[PDB]
Amino acid sequence: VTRFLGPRYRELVKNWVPTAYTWGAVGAVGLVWATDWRLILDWVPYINGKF
Amino acid sequence: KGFSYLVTGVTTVGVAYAAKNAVTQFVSSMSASADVLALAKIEIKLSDIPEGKNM
């Protein structure tokens, strides 16, 4: 809300941004792997067991 | 430290592998029995039907 605005909150979010990126990537890669979503797994380097 | 954490890291891989497989089995059981697919979509039909006739 209104109170959360402030310079130090900006610093905190900038500190934690890389961690959020890594977790977001973990979730994305995990979802595709669990669901074996073909469209994105057809552009991988060597994982092409599907015909 | 790196050695010990490696063991843990490798172990999780195995646990993950089986986990996915197990779930895919139980979920797949709900998809459709083989008989459902056999009875459905099997509608090959000859083109010999004359003009105006309706088989």
Partner: protein
């Protein structure tokens, strides 16, 4: 004198738990394909001729 392989693997990946999880899941992605293919090849090599996929040749394409 070269830094041990495990030490490099720790500082870059294992130190941060988020990267530790990321490398785990990528390893699962890769190991799944490798393990599956290897096991299947072994099973087929144990039973050449018995499995019907090796029999298709004698009768196929009419």
């Amino acid at each position: 004198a070269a830094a041990t392989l495990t030490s490099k693997l720790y500082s870059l990946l294992f130190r941060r738990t988020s990267t530790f999880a990321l490398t785990i899941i990528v390893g699962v992605m890769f190991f799944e394909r490798a393990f599956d293919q290897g096991a299947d090849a072994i099973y087929d090599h144990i039973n050449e001729g018995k499995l019907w996929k090796h029999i298709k040749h004698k009768y196929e394409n009419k």
